[PDB]
Amino acid sequence: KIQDSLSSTPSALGKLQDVVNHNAQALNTLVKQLSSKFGAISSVLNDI
Amino acid sequence: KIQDSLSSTPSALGKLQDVVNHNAQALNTLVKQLSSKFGAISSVLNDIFSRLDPPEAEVQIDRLITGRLQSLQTYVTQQLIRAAEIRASANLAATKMSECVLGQSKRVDFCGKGYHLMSFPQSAPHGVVFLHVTYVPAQEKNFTTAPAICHDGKAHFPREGVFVSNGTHWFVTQRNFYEPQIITTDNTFVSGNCD
Amino acid sequence: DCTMYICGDSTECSNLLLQYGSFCTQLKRALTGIAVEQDKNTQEVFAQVKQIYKTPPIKYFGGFNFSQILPDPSKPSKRSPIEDLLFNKVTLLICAQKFKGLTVLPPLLTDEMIAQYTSALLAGTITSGWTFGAGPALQIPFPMQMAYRFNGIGVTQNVLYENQKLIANQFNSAIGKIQDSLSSTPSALGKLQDVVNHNAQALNTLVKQLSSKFGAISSVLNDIFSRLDPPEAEVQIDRLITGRLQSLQTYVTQQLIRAAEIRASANLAATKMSECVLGQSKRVDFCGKGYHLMSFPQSAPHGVVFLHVTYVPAQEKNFTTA
Amino acid sequence: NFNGLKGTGVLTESNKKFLPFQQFGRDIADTTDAVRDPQTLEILDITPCSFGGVSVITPGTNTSNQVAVLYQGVNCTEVPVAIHADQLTPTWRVYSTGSNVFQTRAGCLIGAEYVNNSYECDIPIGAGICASYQTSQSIIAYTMSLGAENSVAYSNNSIAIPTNFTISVTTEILPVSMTKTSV
Ligand SMILES: *[C@@H]1O[C@H](CO)[C@@H](O)[C@H](O)[C@H]1NC(C)=O
Ligand SMILES: *[C@@H]1O[C@H](CO)[C@@H](O)[C@H](O)[C@H]1NC(C)=O
Ligand SMILES: *[C@@H]1O[C@H](CO)[C@@H](O)[C@H](O)[C@H]1NC(C)=O
Ligand SMILES: *[C@@H]1O[C@H](CO)[C@@H](O)[C@H](O)[C@H]1NC(C)=O
Ligand SMILES: *[C@@H]1O[C@H](CO)[C@@H](O)[C@H](O)[C@H]1NC(C)=O
Ligand SMILES: *[C@@H]1O[C@H](CO)[C@@H](O)[C@H](O)[C@H]1NC(C)=O
Ligand SMILES: *[C@@H]1O[C@H](CO)[C@@H](O)[C@H](O)[C@H]1NC(C)=O
């Protein structure tokens, strides 16, 4: 009964899905924080 | 005796009291940086916009909004340290109530001082308090001991306990309570000669 | 210190630093909490008993040898030779370069009474057995106190007495290989030598940020006060103030994470001394590899060393079963 | 002010030797510790003194109002020399010549006498010395009492077996949760 217990519902293996997602949108927000001006003229360095 | 003990001194409930004072004094410190100057001209927001240049005012409010956010950023970091400390004890509390309460634990000095018998949980604000019913020995006497015995040219070792002599006649008793019995083959097992 | 580290011998920072609010009172409170947590850890790891027991005058222990672990009366310090080998390998004159407010507070328990606590635990675990941690101390001879450690393993006690002499020299020589194995490799105290290095690296590199420019024109305060006027010197020094307080906050945050690590290690060490010394733990691979009999604690600089007297079967033989 | 350098330390004599062109000394941690006098080419030495924490060893407010000021790490053959106006940022200039001092490893404490008994510790201080409140009421300092030296009558034939028992109820307290906060 174990294979039908884990294969049917997708909530059986959430304890690793949230682990591999905690280091997924952390990287995405780290990329997205370059777009912030931080009280400057522009978010890119070459044009200024 | 516990109801007199828990109210005689304030140190009995000091651990849960310290828990609620850290979360109270964190917010008491937190509001006090709202009135902090942070090197600006004022703490009230509308005083910056009253006379300054609006491009210069946005620079002035940038160094103030970062100072207010850094006080909040420090606060979230301080709660994350404290949330990991309580989780180290909550997993210990779940370990205690699944071993001391729902069974008898043979761990020495874990579910109470000395030998442990059972426990009782009680509900307290922001935590839990136990009543670890233990079992601790009392007054004792000392005797003369031999590690073995031999009667028919053959060594005999105890089935349980230890041989104890009171001075004239030997006895075998339990290891944690004085209960002497006469030496019998039901109380011993044989292994080799006695040389 | 708040003002001494950032703007030492600078009175004109005093109105400039105190206007930030109650920022470094939190820093001092956090470091005071770490300082009292170190003393709490040292109190709850070692002091499991309140009666300081004493070793007997004669040192015969049923044919065994414990000369290396008991304190030597010939030395002026009441320590053992194992602490003599352990103290020389741990290295650090390094406190004289800390004139910028970083004052290393001494521990409450000095280095001599910790050795007295370890001597008391040793005198308990040789002469009393496990009963001194669970009420009044009951003295027991050692050739019978070992005979109730096989009985919690799975072998009956008919193999200790009749093989007494053969188990004596097999143990004593097992002490001797500990004497040179600590000096055989430098990694033997690698669990401790890094830790004193962790405060060696962090305290040194805390100094070099105030030597850095941090985006300003000079790392010292007098010359920028001299050649440039105070009506536009706050816009030059706010960078230095913010960078120095941010570096101090980062150092204190790393100190909090390291102290949480030391706390998690210290609770484990207290559990180990609570059941691998004051009894006989049945958990496999907790008090050494294989079956566990007993253990001996030994003091160490900013740590502890356990000697687990384990048990390993050998020379298997084939048989046919039913 | 030697050749454009700023500092407020003492000027003593050191045994270190400079090169004829190497003028300014330094250390590992980037501190100024040695200069050369232009007029005379002898070797100098720079170190500052002194700083340290100040603690108030006090009992409860309703008990009394007397104090015991501690000085962390500072050798107190120096603080009675430093009794001067505009030199002591603490206000009590007359407290440096007060009661009988006792010297510890962490620095001597001023305002408390010493006793040589074996008492339990109430207010820990450090390095095996701590204070309490005792009776003629004054703050004292003493040595740690680690308990009575209980003996062991160990032999090669002696067992000790209890004949009675007392069931006790010991209470321990553990936190579980924390006040939830949203911002
Ligand atoms: C029992 O112990 C006491 C002290 O603990 C000692 O004086 C006495 O001689 C002991 N009794 C025997 C029979 O050894
Ligand atoms: C030992 O116990 C036995 C049985 O109670 C008794 O007959 C004997 O007199 C006792 N001897 C001593 C020395 O107490
Ligand atoms: C214990 O061993 C040391 C050397 O390892 C030896 O000098 C000493 O005599 C021994 N003691 C006993 C009681 O055998
Ligand atoms: C037991 O016998 C098998 C087959 O003869 C052999 O492979 C194995 O090594 C033997 N075990 C031992 C411990 O000698
Ligand atoms: C400075 O003048 C004094 C007095 O003549 C002299 O003794 C000293 O050597 C001079 N030092 C230098 C470096 O010229
Ligand atoms: C203070 O200096 C004297 C000078 O010899 C020394 O003997 C004493 O040990 C020093 N005390 C401290 C606490 O440094
Ligand atoms: C054990 O202690 C209790 C508590 O006072 C007492 O009433 C009882 O008589 C004692 N029993 C023995 C056998 O000493």
Coordinates of C-alpha atoms in Angstrom, one line a residue, chain B residues 76-187:
Chain B
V76 CA 13.3 40.3 12.4
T77 CA 16.8 38.9 12.8
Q78 CA 16.5 38.9 16.6
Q79 CA 13.2 37.0 16.5
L80 CA 14.7 34.4 14.1
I81 CA 17.4 33.7 16.7
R82 CA 14.8 33.4 19.5
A83 CA 12.5 31.2 17.3
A84 CA 15.3 28.7 16.9
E85 CA 16.0 28.6 20.6
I86 CA 12.4 27.8 21.6
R87 CA 12.2 25.2 18.8
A88 CA 15.2 23.5 20.4
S89 CA 13.1 23.3 23.6
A90 CA 9.8 22.6 22.0
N91 CA 11.3 19.5 20.3
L92 CA 12.7 18.7 23.7
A93 CA 9.2 19.2 25.3
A94 CA 7.7 16.9 22.7
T95 CA 10.4 14.4 23.5
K96 CA 9.7 14.7 27.2
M97 CA 5.9 14.2 26.9
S98 CA 6.3 11.2 24.5
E99 CA 8.8 9.4 26.8
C100 CA 8.2 10.5 30.4
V101 CA 4.4 10.7 30.2
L102 CA 3.5 8.0 27.7
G103 CA 6.0 5.5 29.1
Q104 CA 8.9 5.0 31.5
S105 CA 12.3 6.2 30.3
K106 CA 15.5 4.3 31.4
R107 CA 17.6 7.4 30.7
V108 CA 19.4 8.4 33.8
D109 CA 18.8 12.0 34.9
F110 CA 16.5 12.9 32.0
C111 CA 12.9 12.6 33.3
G112 CA 13.8 13.8 36.8
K113 CA 16.6 13.7 39.4
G114 CA 17.5 10.2 40.4
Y115 CA 15.4 7.1 39.3
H116 CA 12.3 8.2 37.5
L117 CA 8.8 6.7 38.1
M118 CA 6.3 8.8 36.1
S119 CA 5.2 12.4 35.4
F120 CA 2.3 14.8 35.0
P121 CA 1.9 17.6 32.6
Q122 CA 0.3 20.9 33.5
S123 CA -0.7 23.8 31.3
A124 CA 1.0 27.2 31.8
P125 CA 0.9 30.4 29.7
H126 CA 3.5 30.1 26.9
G127 CA 5.0 26.8 27.9
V128 CA 4.5 23.7 30.0
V129 CA 5.3 22.7 33.6
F130 CA 5.9 19.1 34.7
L131 CA 5.6 17.3 38.0
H132 CA 8.3 14.6 37.7
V133 CA 7.5 12.0 40.3
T134 CA 10.9 10.4 40.9
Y135 CA 12.2 7.8 43.3
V136 CA 15.3 8.6 45.5
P137 CA 16.9 6.3 48.2
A138 CA 17.5 7.1 51.8
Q139 CA 19.6 6.1 54.8
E140 CA 21.9 3.1 54.3
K141 CA 24.2 0.6 56.0
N142 CA 27.5 -0.9 54.9
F143 CA 28.5 -4.5 54.9
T144 CA 31.3 -6.9 53.9
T145 CA 31.2 -8.3 50.3
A146 CA 32.6 -11.2 48.4
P147 CA 32.4 -11.2 44.6
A148 CA 31.5 -14.9 44.4
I149 CA 30.9 -18.1 46.4
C150 CA 32.0 -21.7 46.1
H151 CA 30.6 -24.7 48.0
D152 CA 31.1 -28.0 46.2
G153 CA 34.5 -27.1 44.7
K154 CA 32.6 -25.0 42.2
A155 CA 32.1 -21.2 41.9
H156 CA 28.6 -19.8 42.0
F157 CA 27.6 -16.3 40.7
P158 CA 24.4 -14.5 41.6
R159 CA 21.4 -14.6 39.4
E160 CA 20.6 -11.1 40.5
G161 CA 22.0 -8.6 43.0
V162 CA 25.1 -9.2 45.1
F163 CA 26.2 -11.3 48.1
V164 CA 26.1 -9.5 51.4
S165 CA 27.4 -10.7 54.8
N166 CA 26.2 -9.1 58.0
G167 CA 29.1 -10.7 60.0
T168 CA 28.1 -14.3 60.6
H169 CA 25.8 -15.5 57.8
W170 CA 25.8 -14.6 54.1
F171 CA 22.8 -13.2 52.2
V172 CA 21.8 -12.3 48.7
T173 CA 19.7 -9.2 48.2
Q174 CA 18.6 -6.7 45.5
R175 CA 20.9 -4.0 44.2
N176 CA 18.7 -1.0 45.2
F177 CA 16.8 -2.2 48.3
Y178 CA 17.8 -4.2 51.4
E179 CA 15.9 -7.5 51.2
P180 CA 18.1 -10.4 52.3
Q181 CA 17.2 -14.0 51.4
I182 CA 18.9 -17.3 52.0
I183 CA 21.4 -18.6 49.3
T184 CA 19.6 -21.0 47.0
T185 CA 20.3 -22.5 43.5
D186 CA 17.2 -20.5 42.3
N187 CA 19.2 -17.4 43.2

